[PDB]
Amino acid sequence: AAIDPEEEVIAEAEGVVHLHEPASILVVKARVYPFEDDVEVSTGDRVAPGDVLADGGKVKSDVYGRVEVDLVRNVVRVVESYDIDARMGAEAIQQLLKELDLEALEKELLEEMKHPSRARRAKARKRLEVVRAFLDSGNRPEWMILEAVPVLPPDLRPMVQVDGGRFATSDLNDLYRRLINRNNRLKKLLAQGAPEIIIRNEKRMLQEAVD
Amino acid sequence: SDPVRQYLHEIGQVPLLTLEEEVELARKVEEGMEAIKKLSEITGLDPDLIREVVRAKILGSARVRHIPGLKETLDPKTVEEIDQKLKSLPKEHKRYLHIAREGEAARQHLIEANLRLVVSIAKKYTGRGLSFLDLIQEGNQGLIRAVEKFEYKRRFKFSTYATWWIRQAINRAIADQARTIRIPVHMVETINKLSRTARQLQQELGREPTYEEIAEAMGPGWDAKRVEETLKIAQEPVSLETPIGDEKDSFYGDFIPDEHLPSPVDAATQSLLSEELEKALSKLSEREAMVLKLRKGLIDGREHTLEEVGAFFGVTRERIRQIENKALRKLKYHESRTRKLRDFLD
Amino acid sequence: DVPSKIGTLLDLSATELEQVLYFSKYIVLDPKGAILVPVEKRQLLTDEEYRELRYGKQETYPLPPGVDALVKDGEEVVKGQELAPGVVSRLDGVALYRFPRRVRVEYVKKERAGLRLPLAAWVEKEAYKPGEILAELPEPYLFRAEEEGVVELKELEEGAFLVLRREDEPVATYFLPVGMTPLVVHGEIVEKGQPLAEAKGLLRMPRQ
DNA sequence: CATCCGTGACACCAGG
DNA sequence: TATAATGGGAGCTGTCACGGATG
Ligand SMILES: [Mg+2]
Ligand SMILES: [Mg+2]
Numbered sequence: 039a040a041i042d043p044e045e046e047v048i049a050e051a052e053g054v055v056h057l058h059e060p061a062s063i064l065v066v067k068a069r070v071y072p073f074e075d076d077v078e079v080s081t082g083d084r085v086a087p088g089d090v091l092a093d094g095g096k097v098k099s100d101v102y103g104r105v106e107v108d109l110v111r112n113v114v115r116v117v118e119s120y121d122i123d124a125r126m127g128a129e130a131i132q133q134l135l136k137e138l139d140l141e142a143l144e145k146e147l148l149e150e151m152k153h154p155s156r157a158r159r160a161k162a163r164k165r166l167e168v169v170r171a172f173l174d175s176g177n178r179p180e181w182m183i184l185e186a187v188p189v190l191p192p193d194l195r196p197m198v199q200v201d202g203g204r205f206a207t208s209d210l211n212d213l214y215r216r217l218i219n220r221n222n223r224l225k226k227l228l229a230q231g232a233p234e235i236i237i238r239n240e241k242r243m244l245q246e247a248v249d
Numbered sequence: 250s251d252p253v254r255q256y257l258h259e260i261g262q263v264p265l266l267t268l269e270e271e272v273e274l275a276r277k278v279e280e281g282m283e284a285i286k287k288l289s290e291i292t293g294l295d296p297d298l299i300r301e302v303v304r305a306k307i308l309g310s311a312r313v314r315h316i317p318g319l320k321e322t323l324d325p326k327t328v329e330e331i332d333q334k335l336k337s338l339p340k341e342h343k344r345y346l347h348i349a350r351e352g353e354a355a356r357q358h359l360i361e362a363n364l365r366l367v368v369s370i371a372k373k374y375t376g377r378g379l380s381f382l383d384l385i386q387e388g389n390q391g392l393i394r395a396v397e398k399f400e401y402k403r404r405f406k407f408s409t410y411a412t413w414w415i416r417q418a419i420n421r422a423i424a425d426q427a428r429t430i431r432i433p434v435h436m437v438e439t440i441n442k443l444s445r446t447a448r449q450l451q452q453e454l455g456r457e458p459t460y461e462e463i464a465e466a467m468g469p470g471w472d473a474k475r476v477e478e479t480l481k482i483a484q485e486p487v488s489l490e491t492p493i494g495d496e497k498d499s500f501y502g503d504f505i506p507d508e509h510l511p512s513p514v515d516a517a518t519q520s521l522l523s524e525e526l527e528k529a530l531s532k533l534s535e536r537e538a539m540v541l542k543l544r545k546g547l548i549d550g551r552e553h554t555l556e557e558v559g560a561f562f563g564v565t566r567e568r569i570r571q572i573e574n575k576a577l578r579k580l581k582y583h584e585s586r587t588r589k590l591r592d593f594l595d
Numbered sequence: 596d597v598p599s600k601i602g603t604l605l606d607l608s609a610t611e612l613e614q615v616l617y618f619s620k621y622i623v624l625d626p627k628g629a630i631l632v633p634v635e636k637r638q639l640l641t642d643e644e645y646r647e648l649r650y651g652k653q654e655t656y657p658l659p660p661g662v663d664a665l666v667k668d669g670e671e672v673v674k675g676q677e678l679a680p681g682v683v684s685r686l687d688g689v690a691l692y693r694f695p696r697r698v699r700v701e702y703v704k705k706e707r708a709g710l711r712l713p714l715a716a717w718v719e720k721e722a723y724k725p726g727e728i729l730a731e732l733p734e735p736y737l738f739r740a741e742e743e744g745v746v747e748l749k750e751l752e753e754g755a756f757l758v759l760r761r762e763d764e765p766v767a768t769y770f771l772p773v774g775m776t777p778l779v780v781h782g783e784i785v786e787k788g789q790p791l792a793e794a795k796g797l798l799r800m801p802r803q
Numbered sequence: 804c805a806t807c808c809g810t811g812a813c814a815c816c817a818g819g
Numbered sequence: 820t821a822t823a824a825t826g827g828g829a830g831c832t833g834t835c836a837c838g839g840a841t842g
Pocket of ligand 1: 464465466467468469470471472
């Protein structure tokens with residue numbers, strides 16, 4: 039095909055096609071699976087070995103990977119990759135903090151306190167003091183991660199008019215404005231389908247804004 | 250360590266496109282949009298919901314959130330329902346779902362490839378009120394717009410069409426965010442025009458222009474008072490934490506007296522005023538004192554009408570007005586005699 | 596505030612906690628049977644190490660102008676196997692073409708042709724595979740036209756085709772296998788019985 | 804069981 | 820809204836003690 043119809047290539051008679059002189063060649067670590075019937079999985083799907091690929095269940099999956107349906111080549115390709123859950127930022131840290139039984143870790147650290155090594159006993163004590171602080175207080179560790187940033191009352195960060203009729207204001211307003219602009223831009227970038235690099239940069243800038 | 254260094258390193262990972270790869274990505278994006286339109290034709294669903302489901306499946310379950318324009322809260326259960334409604338299609342119909350999936354997958358890499366152009370453009374907009382990284386992110390938003398608005402049939406490279414939307418987004422961000430007291434974008438345009446006019450006038454006059462010379466050079470509708478009002482309306486605030494002195498122990502805010510909260514003298518004078526008013530009202534009868542208290546608001550805040558006070562005391566509005574008049578007259582007589590309320594009138 | 600009250604609870608150092616909080620490395624929460632030694636939970640994966648595990652391994656190589664490939668589309672490859680006279684692959688797997696700059700279409704042609712040979716030179720058969728000897732001649736023999744018309748010479752890679760037409764209408768289709776030297780040019784007029792070619796010694800079918 | 808390093812702290816009033 | 824444009828740029832120069840990291 040081409041931009042305009044008078045540039046296309048239509049086959050004059052019956053024949054077979056041969057590709058030569060590629061611009062660049064791509065070597066993937068994938069697995070080919072040609073198909074003949076209605077394919078059951080679309081592009082981007084993640085699939086494990088033994089999963090239905092196409093043709094009502096005839097051709098199935100052999101390796102772990104990600105699906106690349108190829109309607110030109112009529113092959114359901116699969117590139118080796120696991121659905122590994124790995125995150126970044128205060129989101130991951132808050133997850134790990136939420137999934138933390140304090141008594142279990144207290145028991146592990148008490149077991150560590152009987153070790154012959156002096157440094158290991160010391161580090162177990164240092165960890166256990168934080169653990170027991172959270173236990174005796176009743177505070178969840180995850181609260182060290184913010185979801186709802188508080189806002190100071192406005193009279194404690196005023197926007198006042200000086201005698202000259204001009205305005206003078208507190209720095210906390212500009213720091214909050216930084217925070218709100220970055221937060222709103224992140225919410226909009228998530229509303230749309232922004233790629234990984236952009237969302238990562240935005241989240242980093244948001245964390246540094248809170249800082 | 251340095252977030253700009255980190256971003257410029259992440260950007261250097263996605264390689265630049267050769268013309269062929271660029272045209273191929275743009276073509277896949279356009280055909281994917283067409284396929285989403287065709288899928289909306291077939292299913293009868295909303296095209297935005299379909300695009301969101303395809304986008305979710307291409308990005309994964311890592312990002313699934315409610316979209317404002319969508320009538321339904323986009324959760325993995327509903328996206329699975331809609332992906333099943335899309336999976337139960339004939340072959341010549343499900344081919345459109347395949348095309349849409351690959352189109353979204355191409356849009357992602359089309360953005361990521363040209364992320365470098367945004368940096369190379371935004372480095373020239375520093376100093377104008379926004380951080381380098383804020384400019385970069387706004388330029389990336391413009392790049393997303395340019396991706397979704399490109400047309401590869403015109404045979405123009407992507408940079409030519411992308412630079413327009415990138416500049417547009419950076420300039421709109423600067424206009425919308427760089428002021429603590431937000432000013433509408435048209436007024437920012439006017440204030441910038443005023444600044445540039447004054448600058449050219451000083452470059453030709455050897456001194457700063459007056460209001461009248463700027464009004465001259467601005468054209469019709471601009472007098473000196475309008476220039477003065479425009480300059481006044483564009484004054485940015487100053488920090489209350491502005492340093493005063495070489496020692497680090499004085500802030501500009503430390504010298505701004507608080508005018509809102511009443512002073513001790515003000516509160517004491519109001520208290521003595523209320524007490525003297527009660528002393529003067531007790532010299533009336535209960536009814537006329539109550540009539541004045543109801544007519545002026547010393548009872549329930551607001552001021553009642555003659556009809557309300559008359560229906561409350563059970564007399565005619567003329568009678569309540571007559572007893573209000575005689576109450577005021579007795580108060581005037583007592584005030585002329587004792588003069589115990591004059592000093593409160595200033 | 597060192598020692599971090601977050602990094603102490605999770606046995607994460609200051610460096611690791613910064614790398615995770617300010618988006619420099621990933622942290623696994625459910626490796627879903629990943630393998631890099633299998634991936635243990637709470638492991639610091641770099642950007643390359645995370646992409647190689649989440650989106651697979653691949654690479655693209657540039658072909659110089661006019662240089663054709665030494666492999667074919669869709670065919671598996673071993674590491675080190677030269678993909679082209681100037682490209683060596685660093686990994687193994689399915690090679691793929693991006694943009695073929697020359698498409699060759701081998702069209703199918705099923706026709707009917709004729710040929711006259713001395714009987715003492717023929718090698719009788721019910722068919723002839725490519726490269727198979729069709730006849731062996733003890734002396735040069737002049738294949739002569741059996742119609743009058745204009746010559747349509749259509750030379751293949753090896754061997755040729757002759758077609759005669761009277762009023763632009765085809766009247767004869769001859770076939771000259773390898774070992775036959777056509778003695779006519781395209782568009783030539785020929786009367787009955789004149790030499791259209793000369794066979795010498797062995798003559799065999801072309802490879803195509 | 805040392806060295807190295809990042810992070811604290813470094814007088815009061817007055818006027819500024 | 821359309822020629823093409825594809826990785827920044829300062830920085831600017833105590834003195835001590837302490838607790839934690841590393842090596
Ligand atoms: Mg004028
Ligand atoms: Mg002082």
